[PDB]
Amino acid sequence: NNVGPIIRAGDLVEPVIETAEIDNPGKEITVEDRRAYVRIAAEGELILTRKTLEEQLGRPFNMQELEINLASFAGQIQADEDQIRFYFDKTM
C-alpha cells in the first residue's frame, strides 16, 4: 500500500526526499532513483508540508511548484496551500 510522489524535476528530488523523511518520522521511505522519474514512497500515507519544503529549498515555495513537477504519484491526494497528503484508500 505504498504511496507518494514521482518527481520529474531533478532539482526538487533531494528537497522532497528530505521533506518526506522529516514530515513522516519513523516511517520507512523508499526511493527508486531513475532519471527524471524518481519514485518516493511510504506505506499508507506520505505527507509533504509546504513549510518543510520551503525550508529544504531555502527560498520561497508554493505547493504549485511541487504539483506541476510531479510525473505521477501513487495513492490518492488531499492537497491545499499548506501540504499534500498521499494516502491509500482501500475502497478505490
Curated annotation (Swiss-Prot):
InterPro entries: MOase_MmoB_DmpM, mOase_MmoB_DmpM_sf
Phenotypic consequence of gene deletion: Cells lacking this gene show a complete loss of toluene-4-monooxygenase activity.
Keywords: Aromatic hydrocarbons catabolism
GO biological process, one term: toluene catabolic process
Pfam families according to UniProt: MmoB_DmpM (PF02406)
Pathway this chain belongs to: Xenobiotic degradation; toluene degradation
One Gene Ontology molecular-function label: monooxygenase activity
UniProt feature coiled coil, ranges: none
Lipoprotein as UniProt keyword: no
Family: Belongs to the TmoD/XamoD family.
Self-association state and partner proteins as the record states: The alkene monooxygenase multicomponent enzyme system is composed of an electron transfer component and a monooxygenase component interacting with the effector protein TmoD. The electron transfer component is composed of a ferredoxin reductase (TmoF) and a ferredoxin (TmoC), and the monooxygenase component is formed by a heterohexamer (dimer of heterotrimers) of two alpha subunits (TmoA), two beta subunits (TmoE) and two gamma subunits (TmoB).
Role according to the record: Effector component of the toluene-4-monooxygenase multicomponent enzyme system which catalyzes the O2- and NADH-dependent hydroxylation of toluene to form p-cresol. Required for optimal efficiency and specificity of the holoenzyme.
Name the UniProt record assigns to this protein: Toluene-4-monooxygenase system, effector component
Species the sequence originates in: Ectopseudomonas mendocina
Organism classification: Bacteria, Pseudomonadati, Pseudomonadota, Gammaproteobacteria, Pseudomonadales
Gene field: tmoD
